Symmetry: D3
Subunit: 238 residues, 6 copies
């Protein structure tokens, strides 16, 4: 029961050299799948991982025919059978966060397992998050810090009380709990996570691309100040 | 089982010419009922509808003895028995009128709330919805159009950035209960009682210091309206 | 009772307090600050605010204290009821709570109305008694109103729709309802409120103090503008 | 005189105006809206505000008008003095000026005090008579005060230090001094004020109208929060 | 030619123990004079100095009959004849006290205003400076230290982003006239008259409605203090 | 009397292929010189120009030993002897603006001549601007639009009245006029522009680098919302 359905994806030309990240383009949809490929180490990212992740996402950003990015983690671990989206630290990861934030495409994080530390922050900055009911685990390790989108932005999803709780105590939360607080859009059966992700991607791609771009930047504008204004006005310039 | 109770309302004088909107004043309370009156077309609004809506709301804004505005849709559809609050297409001006008026505007979603109709509910101070028939759907995106202001950004100040983005990006249909869970709907009520509950909420609001209610609304607006918000709040302070 | 005397010690220099009690945990870097006027539902009078400010300020300057538990003593000797704070310079207490480099957890053991409700809102976290926590924003029907952290900030917790509801109608809500809306972190059984509070305090204190301070100001920075930047930048200036 | 009758035509539907004059340029997409109560230094009474609102609103809806010149007629028949507006719903006029998709240029031909000063502040641009422009923020000594666009927004033009000076002391300033601080775009000889205003209006109207609208809301967006976003986004929705 | 006029001031009762700060009340006006009293060291402040400064300012904040605070430095240096307002090193708390107090704080820069001393001038509501001896220099950067709050960011709200960045990045020394041109100094005055001019400004401020002045200050602060700014302004409104 | 003093600069290894941009590293200082190299066309930038400019600036951003970036235009025009920093449009230029905005180094724009359209916007987003007294010409062409840093940010330098004027009328301004309004830090003799630029760079580099980084982000934080918070908090994380 692996979330990954190989038949639905094709490798993107120009990335045979990837080792820490897998990059696929859907066989029919204007959707790509970017995933951490280090299950043995719970998909923790090392400097090299960040470089590939940035390269891949930047390429997706510039792909005219791609309207949705599915960001997830491959699994399970061959070592213990566990599941992880991204366990965090082992080009800065902050640049990856901004790339996700600023790209004119909807980025959906598919939390298939542990999402801790920097991995948790990556999920927070994504536009939407779908999570495995059985294996998704949310834990902000930091304080055990990310004073940017990792934290402050979480408050714009679950509220100041819950956000402070998540960070100050660093407890572990399930997909359902995070859904109740407002940080997870929907909970899905583990085996169905990616299938549900592709359904959401399809509904998004079925609408006006220009409208989707404008909307994303309109939502960003609320908290990104001048940068947010630049991107929205930039798209207004057509 | 219709939400409207004829015995509780009286038409406002001076609006006999309204065709797309009904405007009533409660027989006893400082509350008015503004409703879309085109059930035959799922209360979609045409340019003429917006003009009447603006006129009516503007009149309510200036009515010294009115403290609460109930915004809803008349129903059901004469030709399908369906319910609708407003199914969408100056409207931006209507949004600001609702936003800036020193009175609490409660949207009573009795049916479909789509497109511009959905945005109207979002900008209202409070929203109550019909459990059985309220239906929320942000259709702008799949219409090529979009509201990058109070309709969208402000929704995020109600349900959070994740849910707001979902609502707009996918344009799915949600029930009163779902929208209530996300935080965009204050409470769910039986369809037949939507207005009865609305009047009870209006009564509780009107039972308090009007000056305090005005100050509070502008205090809540100030958080996101920047200088405009400051002007309205400080405006009240200067008055004091 | 919520209170477990065996776990607290009085703080030297405060036996002159009459409206507030101030304790230091026997082991944890945590203090307990509580309203001490149960006979009148822990409402605060000018004298109460002075003691509260003094106590909180002292806690703010205590280097070995990382968490402040703010609650109300009970029950009322007059009716057996429970109250955290029933309401009425209190604005200065709010800022003290907001700006202090320590996590302030409000433990709502009973009624939290008016200014009492506003105090809970400004605290970093809130835990509430399932059986006795009662939330009610009274001001409006009294002609008064808190247009600062009491109201605006509540919206940053439960959203604009619910926040406006809470203030405009002034209804009473349970711990559970408030938890559902997002202003209450967790609900606890009355007798366990403080025990749960100490467990949360322990988890907080078990982490890097510098990190916790930085995080609190990072969360404040989102809404405190220049003041928020000053505190975050200042905290960074240390490192 | 500042006014050149040969260049303006009355606007149909406004011969009932008494406190305001409303003209349309014979050639340019520009209108002239002016206070018409020189005998009392163009101070505004409730009736004046109504006409002003009506006129500005009409200008706002005129598709072929890209620039609004806001000034005051003169001189005073009683003392030969000059005034733009001496002060006292006026808040609604401010928003109309702020939100209309047209560039509003205030031409200060004389005294600009109290509400009159606030009107100049909220306009997009200000040109002033070197010999007669007099800026004075009176409110404070009257017990009154404009805590919105009149004050806060002035700070976005001359900076926090100068803005506080202007309001706290309520001193009178010349066109030159105000230009030096940043609230006045340019100083002009009295007789040339309107001629210069039309030249600026012409340069504005010679460019893409859609671009000018977008730019105005882009500048507003910096300080008008959600309202500013609504207007910019709405303007974009067109394209 | 000393700025201070003994005949115009009277010591405040209860502060005989001050060593690093002087605190006077004007003989007739609702104005106080708070000054750094360590000329021998270019009025640099040590921890003890900050404690006294905070105490003094806090007392002024609570003085109902005081509407204006004049913040300056005593001089000249006993051992070099040089002038200094404050040459720099809890101070953040002093900044907020100046920022939040419902009274106008005018900084009179009589000499060197460097490091923390420069930041104090920036946070004051108004600044008047000695033409001959005022010297502005943000030395933090070349000290390895920095003020990323009111000392820096807020300076940008006075001189604009370009000039503010220049002042901090290069740490050059500027005169009263230069700082006035950039917008951080309200007016330049003859050294010997700095305080005389300061009292004239204080008199004009005090001649107006105290309530209005309080409201205005908080209205100006609201622009950049977010929720804190709202709390203080709304605070006054509730009072009303 | 050319502002460029060849003896003081060395080409940066790895950029012999540049055609629209020149990239030098000072012989002694931790300062680089990035300049538009299309004088014949008044240094207008074409898509290829933006690509090189971005590559160069990104490399400067990642150079540990570089603390200051001098951004200017080479000249004069071999066609008419005129001077230009950048005349504007002929990887998006918006990405270049953000790169300048976000890099932890002080970027000084040396306006040696015409600064129009996108060229003017580039000067506005730079941390500091020094301009040639005889040849600097500021003109916002757009409306004849940049609703981001190009415009809104200008208002944070010269005030709302002047900013609106500059954009609505699109008039041409001198170094001195722009200096009076607050958008130009200092005016310098044309032949001395770069020498003065190196002096400013030296004073900046003479201070604590960590302090300079913190300060720049503290100034940005005022208007960059969450993005600004992310960068400042990111540097706070050390
Ligand atoms: O709008 S704010 O980002 O300032 C605060 C968000 C408030 N809410 C957070 C979480 N829930 C999510 C839906 O239950 C509701 C409101
Ligand atoms: O602080 S703001 O960015 O909102 C407005 C800037 C105000 N000023 C602009 C230009 N001058 C520059 C110095 O003369 C002074 C103040």
């Amino acid at each position: 029961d692996n979330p990954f359905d190989a038949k639905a994806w094709r490798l993107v030309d120009g990335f045979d050299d990837l080792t820490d990240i897998t990059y696929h383009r859907h066989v029919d949809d204007a959707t790509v799948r970017v995933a951490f490929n280090r299950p043995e180490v719970r998909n923790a990212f090392r400097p090299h991982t960040v470089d590939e992740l940035y390269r891949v996402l930047d390429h997706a950003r510039m792909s005219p025919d791609v309207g949705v990015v599915l960001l997830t983690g491959n699994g399970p671990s061959p070592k213990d059978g566990g599941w992880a989206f991204c366990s965090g630290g082992d080009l800065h990861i902050l640049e990856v966060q901004r790339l996700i934030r600023f790209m004119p495409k909807v980025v959906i994080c598919l939390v298939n397992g542990w999402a801790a530390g920097g991995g948790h922050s990556l999920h927070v900055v994504c536009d939407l998050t779908l999570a495995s009911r059985e294996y998704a685990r949310f834990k902000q390790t930091d304080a055990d810090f990310d004073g940017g989108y990792g934290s402050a932005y979480l408050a714009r999803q679950v509220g100041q009380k819950f956000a402070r709780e998540i960070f100050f105590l660093g407890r572990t939360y399930t997909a359902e709990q995070m859904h109740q607080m407002g940080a997870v859009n929907a909970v899905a059966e583990h085996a169905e996570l990616e299938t549900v992700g592709l359904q959401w991607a399809a509904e998004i791609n079925a609408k006006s691309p220009q409208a989707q771009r404008m909307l994303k930047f309109a939502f960003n504008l609320l908290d990104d100040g001048l940068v947010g204004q630049q991107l929205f006005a930039g798209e207004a310039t057509r």
